[PDB]
Ligand binder design. Structure first.
Ligand SMILES: O=C(O)CNC(=O)C(=O)O
Ligand SMILES: O=C(O)CNC(=O)C(=O)O
Ligand SMILES: O=C(O)CNC(=O)C(=O)O
Ligand SMILES: [Mn+2]
Ligand SMILES: [Mn+2]
Ligand SMILES: [Mn+2]
Ligand code: NI
Ligand code: NI
Ligand code: NI
Ligand code: NI
Ligand code: NI
Ligand code: NI
Ligand code: NI
Ligand code: NI
Ligand code: NI
Ligand code: NI
Ligand code: NI
Ligand code: NI
Ligand code: NI
Ligand code: NI
Ligand code: NI
Ligand code: NI
Ligand code: NI
Ligand code: NI
Lengths: 374, 374, 374
């Protein structure tokens, strides 16, 4: 029950927030308020204690910051197998990049000053205890990180002591501050984070181009040039009124829209996500199924070609630090769309001229591990 | 009258289309239909003949293509002074990049096959005659270049013979084809082009980010995360309906909007445009005026800083081939906005703490040639 | 008399400080106190006015700083011919690098705050007037630059107004401050500087190695190893007492020393100095003379070789920005020393085995312009 179940992205998330049900988490907590899961599970406490240890910092004897009396180890999933296993599963579950930072603070020391972050967090207490104080957001669902002065935050809303095996979730914009109680024991926790720049605002700006391109093919007013020197000649009343009309027309056009195109979001997720955790040949008469659907991008790029790219060979060692696929002719697009939008498809049923072309396509997909033979 | 008047961008354009009045050009021709200016000016004919010559191709003895029986010399303004002088003036006038291509076709040869272009063109006949046929657009105000089959274009709408000193204007999407009459004389013309990707559609996508950023600061619904796996899990009815609502809200928000921010259009124009054609010290008690306003970008970039960049030191030799400024603290933003939005301003009237800071600002602007002392 | 006489380094310096005699300058002023030369020479005023102009900054339309309300143009000798001519002559005269900076301050503005510099300066007033205040040094003959607070400098010792054609000399460590009088005219001056890190202390550290190398060849105590871990195991009484003895022995050894070797000073001067200002073949029976003696370094470097390097082909454009010669066998050293230490020498008189070797040596020197045929 408490033990992390790596069977599916769903079973991992369900086990991570145990005993809380996912229906409860999404209805009551997600992007709304903090969730504190205090447990009494010595097995889970031993498990959390193995995710990262103070000794792992000395097994790295750049990858960490020294903010006052706090060591921050960036992206431990680069070296810690279990965290790679957890974070990869969460990326499948959220459809968003999932990074992590380890925070180590000696006994009796204050951590970072009061602040809020731009990410949804899952804090796992690994070693020792840490005293937390949570305050009401000044900016609910903040899009940026910010420190907040103690005289602007008010009194804590939640205050508690985290111990190994405990989990704390809180949405972006939650003002917080933590300190290690005086004593012998230092504190070690991992902050697993997701949902950075994954808002409706980000999604609208990511899909707007495809919508304008489609509309302009049918509407000559969108194809019409702007007035001379508009880019240079404080703004004008004329431009805002025309743009209001265009946005209203696009809103009406969306009602009939069946497909939205991602300009960069889908592509950036696929290129940056973690690779899958690592420890039959198709024929004309076989049935195929596309596998790892949420790990693939199918785009048309310039004469144009169909491009397929996946995350199956992504570098684990570069994940979140910030510093693979195929190409086919446009004629293959109908057959590739048949594979994408089908639970299972016969190779002979593909929309290509020769039976050889059908076989070559599926053989290409199989060499990348993008298809499974049923 | 006919002679090109380089006094201002306005006087250059007025003289270029002589005897046609700019009021007539904008009301009747611009982005609507072709304008043929056939003249009887031997002085202008000699002038056009000096803009580019077949001999100039041999004075370049990559910079040109060999499309069938037509030589196309790219961007002659890189070496021809008079064309640099003309094109620079047109960039000020249009607020859009202005490139050119020279077309040389021997007597008796067909040019390029029927097609339409994605730019507004001004064709100047420099040497010999060329036989033109213009057809009705299949795609009015086309956003892309395309060849069109002779059996899809119909009969010509306009047919004429261009000779030196003649000008031909036509909007993007105009299907056309030209051939050099049989005889002794080859044809040389220059196609001055502008308004590539300068439509209302391009402008809407260029300003939309600033609008969403501003709205999301006040609207928590734009700050709210998308549903899990939306980027991956064919599109849904839910997303299109939410996006329709957001676009309608943004349209209402635009009515009250006084300023629009350019994400890239203004910046790309400034970085790529031609430099100005080339052949008093400010004090605390002096009056200053910002000069070359349409050659400057003032942006805030990340801690944030105010960045100023101009086109006054742009490379002439790289113009349109595709292969300078200052930095100030955020405190200077109010004073820089005072300079931008003022016909003339006293240095002592600037919103800065010390009189020295006021003097340093204007001295910085003067070293870049961005200010004039009144 | 007042006009700059470029006949020799001596005649240039004599004319630069006119009407002051060089005997007076060295006895009374050099490294002792300021010298103000206020003149009434309209010809010299016109001459100074041509050395650098506010317009020369716009003829550069990195090479300058913008310190508050003062523009500082670094190393104008890179582009200004007359300043190259002056500074090159001064490097011959001083045997020290001679750089310059132009200072431009608008009317009514304060210059840099009170400070002292680490160089000997010759300030030439080129355009307008500047109000100077000189104070008593806090650090006489300072080795570093430093600002000094107004409450630590006392009252001015000297106060004057510089006008075009005026010269001001002051030693390193002289606290000073200048401001442009209120009015219409900006101020332009050039600060010609020399004697940076050219002290007895610098010279002692530059020659000490050669002295220790020579002494250790004869003294086994200098060849003896230090005690184990001396470099690591706060200092000890034993080391200081031994070092006192060594320094006393070296002092006694210097009395008999006839030649001092430069570890880097001579080499750095030759590599960085300005090239000479630009607008017979030797035979066995000819008499030769080494020319540009103060532009050449003769060193033995590793099997060892004799290396000759000169400054005759130094880059003018890189002077003071901070970002040529021959090689011969060790057997040639006696003959090269004969050329160095002789006002004129017969080629046949050189200490080399064959007459051909004598001819080859002098032919090598002639190709670099290091020898003149008498
Ligand atoms: O432990 C700390 O000092 C601070 N940790 C965080 O801000 C966090 O996990 O977001
Ligand atoms: O001259 C030609 O053959 C074709 N010229 C053009 O297509 C043009 O100027 O757009
Ligand atoms: O002119 C000024 O403001 C200051 N000039 C100097 O410090 C100088 O020449 O050393
Ligand atoms: Mn128990
Ligand atoms: Mn006539
Ligand atoms: Mn006089
Ligand atoms: Ni860091
Ligand atoms: Ni935090
Ligand atoms: Ni506490
Ligand atoms: Ni990247
Ligand atoms: Ni591969
Ligand atoms: Ni194929
Ligand atoms: Ni080309
Ligand atoms: Ni064309
Ligand atoms: Ni014809
Ligand atoms: Ni570019
Ligand atoms: Ni510049
Ligand atoms: Ni300033
Ligand atoms: Ni500098
Ligand atoms: Ni100084
Ligand atoms: Ni004064
Ligand atoms: Ni150097
Ligand atoms: Ni040489
Ligand atoms: Ni020899």
């Amino acid at each position: 029950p408490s033990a992390l179940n790596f069977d599916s992205p769903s079973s991992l998330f369900e086990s991570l927030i145990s005993p809380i049900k996912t229906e409860t988490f999404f209805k009551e907590f997600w992007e709304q308020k903090p969730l504190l899961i205090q447990r009494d599970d010595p097995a889970l406490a031993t498990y959390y204690g193995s995710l990262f240890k103070l000794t792992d910092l000395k097994s790295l004897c750049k990858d960490f910051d020294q903010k006052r009396a706090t060591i921050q180890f960036h992206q431990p999933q680069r070296f810690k197998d279990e965290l790679w296993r957890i974070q990869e599963k969460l990326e499948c579950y959220f459809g968003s990049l999932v990074g992590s930072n380890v925070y180590i603070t000696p006994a009796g020391s204050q951590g970072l000053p009061p602040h809020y972050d731009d990410v949804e967090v899952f804090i796992l207490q690994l070693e020792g205890e840490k005293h937390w104080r949570l305050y009401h957001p000044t900016v609910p669902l903040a899009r940026e990180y910010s420190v907040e002065a103690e005289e602007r935050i008010g009194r804590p809303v939640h205050e508690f002591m985290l111990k190994p095996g405990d989990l704390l979730y809180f949405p972006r914009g939650t003002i917080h501050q933590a300190d290690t109680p005086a004593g012998l024991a230092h504190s070690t926790h991992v902050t697993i984070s997701t949902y950075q720049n994954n808002s409706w605002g980000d999604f609208l700006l990511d899909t707007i181009s495809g919508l304008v391109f489609d509309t302009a093919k049918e509407d000559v007013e969108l194809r019409t040039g702007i007035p001379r020197q508009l880019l240079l000649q404080e703004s004008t009343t004329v431009a805002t009124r025309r743009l209001s009309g265009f946005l209203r027309t696009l809103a009406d056009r969306l009602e009939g829209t069946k497909e939205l195109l991602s300009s960069d979001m889908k592509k950036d997720f696929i290129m940056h996500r973690l690779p899958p955790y690592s420890a039959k040949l198709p024929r004309l008469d076989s049935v195929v199924r596309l596998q790892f659907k949420d790990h693939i991008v199918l785009t048309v790029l310039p004469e144009k070609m169909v491009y397929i790219y996946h995350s199956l060979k992504n570098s684990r060692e570069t994940h979140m630090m910030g510093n693979h696929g195929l190409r086919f002719p446009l004629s293959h697009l109908d057959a590739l769309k048949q594979i994408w939008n089908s639970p299972a498809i016969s190779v002979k049923d593909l929309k290509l001229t020769t039976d050889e072309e059908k076989e070559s396509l599926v053989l290409s997909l199989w060499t990348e591990c993008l298809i499974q033979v049923v």
